CSV table of C-alpha atoms and ligand atoms in Angstrom, one decimal:
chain,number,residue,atom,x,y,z
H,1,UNK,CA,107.2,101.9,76.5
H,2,UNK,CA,111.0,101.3,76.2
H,3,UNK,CA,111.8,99.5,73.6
H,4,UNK,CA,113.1,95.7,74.6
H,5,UNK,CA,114.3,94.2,71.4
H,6,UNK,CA,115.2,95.0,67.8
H,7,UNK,CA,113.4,92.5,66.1
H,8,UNK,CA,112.4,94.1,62.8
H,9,UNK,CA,108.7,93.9,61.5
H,10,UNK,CA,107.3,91.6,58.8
H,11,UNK,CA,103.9,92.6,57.0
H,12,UNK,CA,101.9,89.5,55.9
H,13,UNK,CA,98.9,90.2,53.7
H,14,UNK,CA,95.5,88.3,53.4
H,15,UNK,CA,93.1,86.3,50.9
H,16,UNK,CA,93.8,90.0,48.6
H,17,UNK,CA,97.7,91.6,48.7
H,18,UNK,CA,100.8,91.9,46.6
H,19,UNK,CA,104.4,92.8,46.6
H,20,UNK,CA,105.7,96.3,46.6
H,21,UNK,CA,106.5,96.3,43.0
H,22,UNK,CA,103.1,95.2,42.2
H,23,UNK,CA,99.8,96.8,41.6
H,24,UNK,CA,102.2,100.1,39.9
H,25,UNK,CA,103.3,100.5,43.3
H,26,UNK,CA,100.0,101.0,45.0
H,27,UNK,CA,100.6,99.6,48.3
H,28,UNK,CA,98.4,97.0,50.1
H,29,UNK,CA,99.6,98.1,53.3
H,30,UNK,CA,98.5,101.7,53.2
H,31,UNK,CA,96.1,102.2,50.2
H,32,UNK,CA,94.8,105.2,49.3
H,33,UNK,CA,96.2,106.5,53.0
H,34,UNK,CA,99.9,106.0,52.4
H,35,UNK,CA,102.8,103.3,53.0
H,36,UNK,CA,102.6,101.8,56.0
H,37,UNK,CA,106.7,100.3,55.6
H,38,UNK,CA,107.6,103.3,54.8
H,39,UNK,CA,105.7,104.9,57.9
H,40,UNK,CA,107.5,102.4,60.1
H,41,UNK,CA,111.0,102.2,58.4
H,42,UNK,CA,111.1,106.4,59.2
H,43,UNK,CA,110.0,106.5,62.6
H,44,UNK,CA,113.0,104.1,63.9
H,45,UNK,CA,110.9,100.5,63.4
H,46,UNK,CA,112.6,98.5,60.6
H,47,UNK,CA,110.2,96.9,58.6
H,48,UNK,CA,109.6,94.5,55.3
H,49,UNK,CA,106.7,93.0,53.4
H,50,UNK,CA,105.4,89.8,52.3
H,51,UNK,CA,104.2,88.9,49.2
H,52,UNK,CA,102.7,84.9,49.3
H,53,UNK,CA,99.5,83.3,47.2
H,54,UNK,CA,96.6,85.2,48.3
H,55,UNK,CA,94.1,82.4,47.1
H,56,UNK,CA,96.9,79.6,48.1
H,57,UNK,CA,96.2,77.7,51.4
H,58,UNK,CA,98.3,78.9,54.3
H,59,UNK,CA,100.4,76.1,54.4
H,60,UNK,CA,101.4,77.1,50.9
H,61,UNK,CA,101.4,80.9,52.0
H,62,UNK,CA,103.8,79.5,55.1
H,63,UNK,CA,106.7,77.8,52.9
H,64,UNK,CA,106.3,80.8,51.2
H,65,UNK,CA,106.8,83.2,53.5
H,66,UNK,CA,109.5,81.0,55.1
H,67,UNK,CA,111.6,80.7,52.0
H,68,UNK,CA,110.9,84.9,51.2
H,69,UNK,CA,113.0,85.2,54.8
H,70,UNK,CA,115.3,82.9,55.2
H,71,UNK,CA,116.4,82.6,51.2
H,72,UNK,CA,116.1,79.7,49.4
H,73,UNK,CA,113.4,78.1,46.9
H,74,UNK,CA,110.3,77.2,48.1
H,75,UNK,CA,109.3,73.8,49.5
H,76,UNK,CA,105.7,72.4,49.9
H,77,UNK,CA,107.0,69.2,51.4
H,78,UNK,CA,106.9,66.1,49.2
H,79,UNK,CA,103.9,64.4,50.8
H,80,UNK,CA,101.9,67.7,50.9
H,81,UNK,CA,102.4,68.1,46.9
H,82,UNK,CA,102.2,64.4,45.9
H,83,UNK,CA,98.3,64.5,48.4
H,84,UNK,CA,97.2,67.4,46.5
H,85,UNK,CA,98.7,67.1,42.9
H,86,UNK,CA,101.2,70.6,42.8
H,87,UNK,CA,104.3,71.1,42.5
H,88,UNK,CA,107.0,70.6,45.4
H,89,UNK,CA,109.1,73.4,44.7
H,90,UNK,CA,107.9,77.0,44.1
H,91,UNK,CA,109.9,80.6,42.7
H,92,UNK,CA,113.5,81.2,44.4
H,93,UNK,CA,113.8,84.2,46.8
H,94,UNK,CA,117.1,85.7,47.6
H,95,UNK,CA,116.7,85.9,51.3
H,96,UNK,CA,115.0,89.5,53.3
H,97,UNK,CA,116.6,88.5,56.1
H,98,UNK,CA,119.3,85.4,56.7
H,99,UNK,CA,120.4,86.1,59.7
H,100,UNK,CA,116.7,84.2,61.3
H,101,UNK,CA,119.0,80.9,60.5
H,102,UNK,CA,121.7,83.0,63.1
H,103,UNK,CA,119.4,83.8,65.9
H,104,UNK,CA,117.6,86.6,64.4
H,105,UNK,CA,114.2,86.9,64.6
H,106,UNK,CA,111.0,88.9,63.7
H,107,UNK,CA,107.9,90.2,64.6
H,108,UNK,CA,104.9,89.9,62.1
H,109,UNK,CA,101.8,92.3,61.7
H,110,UNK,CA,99.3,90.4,59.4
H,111,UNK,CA,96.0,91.4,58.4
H,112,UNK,CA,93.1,88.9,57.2
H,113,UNK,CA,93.7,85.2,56.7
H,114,UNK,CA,97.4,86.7,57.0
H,115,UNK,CA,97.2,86.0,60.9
H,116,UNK,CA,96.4,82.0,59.9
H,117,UNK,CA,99.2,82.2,57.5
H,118,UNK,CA,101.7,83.9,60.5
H,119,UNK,CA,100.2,81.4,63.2
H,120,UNK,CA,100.7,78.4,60.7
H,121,UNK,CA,104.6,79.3,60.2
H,122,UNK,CA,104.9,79.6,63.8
H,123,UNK,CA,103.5,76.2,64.1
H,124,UNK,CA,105.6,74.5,61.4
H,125,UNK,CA,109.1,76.6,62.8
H,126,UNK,CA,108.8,74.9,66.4
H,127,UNK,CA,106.8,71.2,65.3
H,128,UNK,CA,107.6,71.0,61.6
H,129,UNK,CA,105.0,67.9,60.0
H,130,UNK,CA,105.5,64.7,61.1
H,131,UNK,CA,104.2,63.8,57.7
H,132,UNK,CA,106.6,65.6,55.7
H,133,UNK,CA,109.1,63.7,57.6
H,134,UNK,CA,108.0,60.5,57.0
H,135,UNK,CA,106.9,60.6,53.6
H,136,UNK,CA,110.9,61.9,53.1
H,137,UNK,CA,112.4,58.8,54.9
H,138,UNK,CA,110.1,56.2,53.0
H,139,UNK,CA,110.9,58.0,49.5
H,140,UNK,CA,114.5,59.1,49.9
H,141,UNK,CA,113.9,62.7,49.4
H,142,UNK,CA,115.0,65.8,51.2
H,143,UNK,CA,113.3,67.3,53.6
H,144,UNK,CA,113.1,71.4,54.1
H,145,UNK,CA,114.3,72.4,57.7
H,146,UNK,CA,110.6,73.7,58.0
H,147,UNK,CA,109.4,70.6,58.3
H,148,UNK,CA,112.4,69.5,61.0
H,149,UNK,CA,110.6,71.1,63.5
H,150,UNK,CA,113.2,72.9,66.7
H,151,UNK,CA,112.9,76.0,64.5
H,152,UNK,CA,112.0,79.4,66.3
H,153,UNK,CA,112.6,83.1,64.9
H,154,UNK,CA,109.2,84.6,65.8
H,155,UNK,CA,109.3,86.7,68.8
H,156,UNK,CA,105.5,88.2,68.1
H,157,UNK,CA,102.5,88.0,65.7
H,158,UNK,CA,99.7,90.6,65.6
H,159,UNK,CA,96.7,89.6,64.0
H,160,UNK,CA,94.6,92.7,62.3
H,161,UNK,CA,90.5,91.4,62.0
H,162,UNK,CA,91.8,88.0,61.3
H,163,UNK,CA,89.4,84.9,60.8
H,164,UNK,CA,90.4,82.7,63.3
H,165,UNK,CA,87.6,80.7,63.5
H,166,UNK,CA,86.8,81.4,59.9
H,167,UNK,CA,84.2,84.0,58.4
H,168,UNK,CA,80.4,83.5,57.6
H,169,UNK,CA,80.9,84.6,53.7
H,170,UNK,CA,82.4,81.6,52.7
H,171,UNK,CA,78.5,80.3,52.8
H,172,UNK,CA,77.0,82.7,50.9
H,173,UNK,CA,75.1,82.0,47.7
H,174,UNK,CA,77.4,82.7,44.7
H,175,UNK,CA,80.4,83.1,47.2
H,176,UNK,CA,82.5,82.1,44.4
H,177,UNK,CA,81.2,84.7,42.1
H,178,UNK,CA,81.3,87.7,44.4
H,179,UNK,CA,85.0,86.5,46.0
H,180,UNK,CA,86.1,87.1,42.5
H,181,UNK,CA,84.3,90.9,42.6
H,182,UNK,CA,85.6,91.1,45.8
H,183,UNK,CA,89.5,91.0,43.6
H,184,UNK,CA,87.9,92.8,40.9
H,185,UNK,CA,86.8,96.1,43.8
H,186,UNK,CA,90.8,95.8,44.8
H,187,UNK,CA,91.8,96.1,41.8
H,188,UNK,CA,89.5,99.0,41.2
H,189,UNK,CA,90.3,100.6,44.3
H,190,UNK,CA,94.2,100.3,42.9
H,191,UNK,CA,93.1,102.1,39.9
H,192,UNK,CA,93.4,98.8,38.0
H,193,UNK,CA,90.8,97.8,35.3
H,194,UNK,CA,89.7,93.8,35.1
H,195,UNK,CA,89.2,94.6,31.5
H,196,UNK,CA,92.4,95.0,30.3
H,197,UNK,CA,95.1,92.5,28.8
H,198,UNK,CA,98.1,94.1,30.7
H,199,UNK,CA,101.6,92.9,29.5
H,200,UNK,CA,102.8,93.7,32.8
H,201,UNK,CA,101.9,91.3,35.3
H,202,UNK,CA,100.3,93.6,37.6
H,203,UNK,CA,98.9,91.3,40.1
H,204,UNK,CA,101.0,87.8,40.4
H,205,UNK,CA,98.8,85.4,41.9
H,206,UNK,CA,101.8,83.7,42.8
H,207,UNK,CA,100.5,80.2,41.6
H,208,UNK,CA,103.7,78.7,40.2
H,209,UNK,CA,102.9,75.0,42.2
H,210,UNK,CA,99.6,74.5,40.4
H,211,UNK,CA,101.4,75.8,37.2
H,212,UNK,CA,98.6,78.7,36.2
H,213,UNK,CA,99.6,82.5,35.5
H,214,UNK,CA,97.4,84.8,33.5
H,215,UNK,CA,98.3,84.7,29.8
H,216,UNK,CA,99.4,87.2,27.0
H,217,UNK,CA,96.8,88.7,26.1
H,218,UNK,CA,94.3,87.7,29.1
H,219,UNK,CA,92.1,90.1,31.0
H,220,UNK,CA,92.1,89.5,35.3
H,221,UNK,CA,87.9,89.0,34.1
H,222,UNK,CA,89.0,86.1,31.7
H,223,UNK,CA,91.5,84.8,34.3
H,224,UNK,CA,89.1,84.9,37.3
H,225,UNK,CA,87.0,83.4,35.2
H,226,UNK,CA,90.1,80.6,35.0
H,227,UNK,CA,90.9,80.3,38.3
H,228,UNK,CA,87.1,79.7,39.5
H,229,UNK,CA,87.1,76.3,37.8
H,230,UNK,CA,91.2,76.0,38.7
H,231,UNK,CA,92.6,73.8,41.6
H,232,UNK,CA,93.6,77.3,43.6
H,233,UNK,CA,89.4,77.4,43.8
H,234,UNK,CA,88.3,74.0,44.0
H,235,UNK,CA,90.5,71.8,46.1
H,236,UNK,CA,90.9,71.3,50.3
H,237,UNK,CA,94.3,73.0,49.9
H,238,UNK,CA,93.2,76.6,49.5
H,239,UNK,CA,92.4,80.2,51.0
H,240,UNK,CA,88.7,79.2,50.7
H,241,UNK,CA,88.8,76.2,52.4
H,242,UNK,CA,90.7,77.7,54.8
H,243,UNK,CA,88.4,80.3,55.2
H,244,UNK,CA,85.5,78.7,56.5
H,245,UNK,CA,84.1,77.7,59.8
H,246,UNK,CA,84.8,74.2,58.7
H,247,UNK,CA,88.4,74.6,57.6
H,248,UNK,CA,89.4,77.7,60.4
H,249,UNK,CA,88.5,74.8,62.9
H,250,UNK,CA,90.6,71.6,61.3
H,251,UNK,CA,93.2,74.8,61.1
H,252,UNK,CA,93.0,75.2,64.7
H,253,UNK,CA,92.7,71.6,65.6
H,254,UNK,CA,96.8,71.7,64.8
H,255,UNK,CA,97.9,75.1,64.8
H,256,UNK,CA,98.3,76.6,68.2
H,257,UNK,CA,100.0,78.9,70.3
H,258,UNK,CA,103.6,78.6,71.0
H,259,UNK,CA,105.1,79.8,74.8
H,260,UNK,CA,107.8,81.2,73.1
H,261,UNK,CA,105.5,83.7,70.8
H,262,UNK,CA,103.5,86.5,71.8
H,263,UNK,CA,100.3,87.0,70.0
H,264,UNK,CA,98.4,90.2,69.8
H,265,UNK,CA,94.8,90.1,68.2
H,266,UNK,CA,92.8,93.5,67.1
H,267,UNK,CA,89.2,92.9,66.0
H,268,UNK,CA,87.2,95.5,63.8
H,269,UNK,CA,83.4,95.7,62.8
H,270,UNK,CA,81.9,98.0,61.0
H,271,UNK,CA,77.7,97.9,61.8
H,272,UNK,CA,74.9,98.6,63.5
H,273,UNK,CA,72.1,96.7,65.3
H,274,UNK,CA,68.8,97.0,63.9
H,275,UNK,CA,65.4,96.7,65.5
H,276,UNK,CA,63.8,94.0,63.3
H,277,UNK,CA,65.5,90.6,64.5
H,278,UNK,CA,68.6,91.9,65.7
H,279,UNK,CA,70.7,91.5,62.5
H,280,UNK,CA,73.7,94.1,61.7
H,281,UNK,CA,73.8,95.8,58.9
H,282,UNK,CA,76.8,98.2,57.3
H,283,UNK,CA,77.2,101.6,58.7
H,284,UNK,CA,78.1,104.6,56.6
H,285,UNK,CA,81.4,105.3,55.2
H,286,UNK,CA,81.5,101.1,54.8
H,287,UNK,CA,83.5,100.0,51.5
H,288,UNK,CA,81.1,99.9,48.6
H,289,UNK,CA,81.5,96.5,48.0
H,290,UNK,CA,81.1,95.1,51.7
H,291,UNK,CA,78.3,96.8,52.1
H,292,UNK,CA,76.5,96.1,49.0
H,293,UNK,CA,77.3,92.4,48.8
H,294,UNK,CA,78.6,91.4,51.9
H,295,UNK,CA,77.1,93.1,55.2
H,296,UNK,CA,74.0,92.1,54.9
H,297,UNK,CA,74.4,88.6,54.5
H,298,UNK,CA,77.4,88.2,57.4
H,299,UNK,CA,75.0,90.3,59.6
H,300,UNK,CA,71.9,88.0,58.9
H,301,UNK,CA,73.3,84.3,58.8
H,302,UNK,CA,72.9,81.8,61.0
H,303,UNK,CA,73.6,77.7,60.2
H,304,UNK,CA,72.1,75.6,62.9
H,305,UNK,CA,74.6,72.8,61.3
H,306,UNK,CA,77.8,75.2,61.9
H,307,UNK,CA,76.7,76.7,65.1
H,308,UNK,CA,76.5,80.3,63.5
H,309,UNK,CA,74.4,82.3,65.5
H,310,UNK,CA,74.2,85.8,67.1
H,311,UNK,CA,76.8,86.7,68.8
H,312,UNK,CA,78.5,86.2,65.0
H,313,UNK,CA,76.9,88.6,63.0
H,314,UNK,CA,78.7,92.1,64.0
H,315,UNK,CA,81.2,92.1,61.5
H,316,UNK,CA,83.5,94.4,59.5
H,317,UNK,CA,82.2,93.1,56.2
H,318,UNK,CA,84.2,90.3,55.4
H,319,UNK,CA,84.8,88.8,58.7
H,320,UNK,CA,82.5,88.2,61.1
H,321,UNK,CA,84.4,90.1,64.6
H,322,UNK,CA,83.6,87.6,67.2
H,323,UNK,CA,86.3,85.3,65.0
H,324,UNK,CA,88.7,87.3,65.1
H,325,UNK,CA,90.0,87.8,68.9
H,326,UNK,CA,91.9,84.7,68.4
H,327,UNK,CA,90.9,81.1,67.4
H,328,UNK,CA,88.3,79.4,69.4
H,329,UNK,CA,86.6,76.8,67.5
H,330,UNK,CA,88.7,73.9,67.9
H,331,UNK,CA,91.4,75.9,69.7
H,332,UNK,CA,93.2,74.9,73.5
H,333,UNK,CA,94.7,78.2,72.9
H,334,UNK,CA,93.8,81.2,75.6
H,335,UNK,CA,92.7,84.3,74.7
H,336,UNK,CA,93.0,86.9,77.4
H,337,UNK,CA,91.8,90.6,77.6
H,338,UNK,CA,94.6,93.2,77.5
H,339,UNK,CA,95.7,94.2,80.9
H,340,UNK,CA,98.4,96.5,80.0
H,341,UNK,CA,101.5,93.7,79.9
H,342,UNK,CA,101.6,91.5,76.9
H,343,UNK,CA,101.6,87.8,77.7
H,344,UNK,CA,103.9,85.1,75.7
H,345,UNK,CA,102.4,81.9,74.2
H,346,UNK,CA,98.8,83.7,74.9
H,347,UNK,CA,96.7,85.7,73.0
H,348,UNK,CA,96.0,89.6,74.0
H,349,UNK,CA,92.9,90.7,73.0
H,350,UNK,CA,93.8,94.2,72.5
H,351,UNK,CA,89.9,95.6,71.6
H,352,UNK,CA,87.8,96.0,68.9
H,353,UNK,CA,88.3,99.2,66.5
H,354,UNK,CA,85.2,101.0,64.5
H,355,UNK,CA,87.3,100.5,61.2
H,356,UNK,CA,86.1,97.6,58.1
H,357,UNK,CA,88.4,95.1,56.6
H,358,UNK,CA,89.9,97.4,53.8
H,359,UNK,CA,89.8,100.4,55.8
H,360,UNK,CA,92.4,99.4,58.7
H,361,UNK,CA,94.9,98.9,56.2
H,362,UNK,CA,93.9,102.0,54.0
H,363,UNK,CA,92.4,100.3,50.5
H,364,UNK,CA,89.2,102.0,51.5
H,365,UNK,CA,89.3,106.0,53.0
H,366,UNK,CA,88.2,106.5,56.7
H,367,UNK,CA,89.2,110.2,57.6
H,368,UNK,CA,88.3,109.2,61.2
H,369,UNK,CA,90.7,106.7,61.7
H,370,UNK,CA,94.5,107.8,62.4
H,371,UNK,CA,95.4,105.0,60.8
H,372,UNK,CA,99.3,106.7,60.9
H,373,UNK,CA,99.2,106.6,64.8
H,374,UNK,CA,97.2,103.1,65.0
H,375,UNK,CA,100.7,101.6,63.0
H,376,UNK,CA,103.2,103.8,65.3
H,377,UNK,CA,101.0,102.4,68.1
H,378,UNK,CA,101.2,98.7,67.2
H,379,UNK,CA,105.2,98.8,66.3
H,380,UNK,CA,106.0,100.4,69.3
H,381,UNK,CA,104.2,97.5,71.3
H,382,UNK,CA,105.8,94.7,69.6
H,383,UNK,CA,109.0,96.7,70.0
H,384,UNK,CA,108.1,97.0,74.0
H,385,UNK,CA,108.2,93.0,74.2
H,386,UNK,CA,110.7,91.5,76.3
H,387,UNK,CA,113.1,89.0,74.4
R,401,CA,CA1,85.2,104.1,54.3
R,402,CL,CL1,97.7,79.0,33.0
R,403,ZN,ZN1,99.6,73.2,48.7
């Protein structure tokens, strides 16, 4: 498809990822198959990456990610930090790309809670809060532009097995336990020991606001350890709250689809019916770790309280895939099927790919999947988009 705008392409990581730099260069966006930027960058698609909190709440992750593009020094609005006791301001950026405050604009691929995060700054860009700009008035305070609302530099967002309506694993016994395994598999999968007191930061958790870092000395097993009792884990105004049925819903209550944004979903799952009860459970080649400690439950769950029943437990073992077409559960937004012509301000459902959660962006090996050509595929699309 002809190309129709030059928008360059913004990765946006989920509840695991980390900057280029990070990790000794092993990239989250490519894994053990490659760089995915790099992929992009070479075939003719200019594309950067995000680095934001990946235990921070999107709103965080948003001002984040806003500030990363645009330049400037974080802002997590004055009421927002004074309601949940962090910081207003987080780390300075110099700016990826400046000319979005000119009338350039973007395109962003995200992958896991990344596509709440993306949705979320789209939000904020075109209605800002009209909390933020209240509580600014009443206090004599600034007020970031964010928050201003009129904003728009987003021309498309494609969400990769996103939880849109929040994912099933949140629930699980000892969640908060085997969330923290879930970072320590990453890590591991990065060739990166939880046992070890690196000098080097190696994974930043980006957690400036609430004022925590891992110390001198500190293991990531002594620092999860930390951050499971830490605000990042126990307060509203986090990924995990986020995360759940109950908070992808509140999310949705607010953050919808803009007419000026194309939105592109891809689901994934990863198992198989059985022929007990009709639960899924992992297929072969599954990550390890999903399929040790996480298939089974998301493909045997149900909550007559939350509504969780069947048609939720195919999953790619972390999410369950009926979430992730686009959101739904407190949602006005319209999901449609893809025809063959993207739609603006609607979701395209663009089908459901036999890859798990840390395979489609490489973490985990899947021969099978051309993962190269699935990237080429999706760049060209968002590159096909009409301005
Ligand atoms: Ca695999
Ligand atoms: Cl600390
Ligand atoms: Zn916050």
């Amino acid at each position: 498809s002809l190309r129709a705008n030059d928008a360059p392409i913004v990765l946006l990581h989920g509840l695991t990822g980390w900057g280029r730099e990070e990790m000794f260069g092993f990239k989250y966006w490519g894994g053990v198959r490659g760089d995915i930027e790099q992929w992009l960058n070479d075939n003719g698609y200019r594309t950067y990456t995000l680095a934001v909190g990946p235990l921070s709440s999107n709103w965080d992750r948003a001002c984040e990610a806003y500030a990363q593009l645009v330049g400037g020094t974080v802002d997590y609005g004055a009421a927002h930090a004074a309601k949940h006791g962090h910081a207003r301001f987080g780390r300075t950026y110099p700016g990826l790309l400046p000319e979005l405050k000119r009338g350039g604009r973007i395109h962003i691929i995200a992958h896991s809670q990344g596509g709440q995060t993306a949705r979320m700054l789209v939000s904020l860009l075109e209605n800002g809060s009209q909390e933020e700009r209240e509580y600014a008035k009443a206090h004599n305070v600034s007020l970031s532009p964010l928050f201003e609302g009129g904003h728009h530099f987003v021309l498309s967002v494609t969400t990769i097995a996103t939880p849109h309506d929040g994912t099933t694993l949140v629930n699980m016994v000892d969640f908060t336990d085997r969330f923290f395994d879930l970072q320590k598999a990453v890590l591991e999968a990065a060739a990166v020991a939880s046992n070890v007191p690196y000098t080097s930061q190696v994974y930043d958790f980006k957690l400036d606001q609430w004022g925590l870092r891992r110390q001198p000395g500190e293991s990531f097993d002594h620092y999860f350890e930390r951050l499971k009792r830490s605000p990042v884990w126990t307060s509203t105004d986090t990924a995990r709250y986020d995360l759940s049925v109950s908070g992808a819903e509140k999310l949705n209550q607010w953050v919808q689809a803009s007419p000026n944004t194309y939105y592109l979903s891809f689901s994934t799952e990863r198992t198989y019916r059985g022929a007990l009860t009709g639960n899924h459970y992992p297929e072969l080649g599954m990550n390890a770790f999903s399929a040790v400690v996480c298939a089974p439950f998301l493909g045997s769950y149900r909550n007559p309280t939350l509504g969780i029943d069947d048609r939720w437990l195919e999953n790619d073992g972390i999410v369950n895939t009926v979430s992730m077409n686009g959101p739904k559960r407190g949602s006005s937004d319209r999901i449609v099927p893809y025809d063959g012509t993207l739609k603006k301000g609607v979701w395209n459902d663009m089908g459901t790919y036999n890859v798990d959660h840390l395979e489609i962006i490489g973490v985990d090996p899947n021969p099978s999947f051309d993962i190269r050509a699935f990237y080429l595929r999706l760049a060209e699309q968002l590159a096909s988009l009409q301005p």
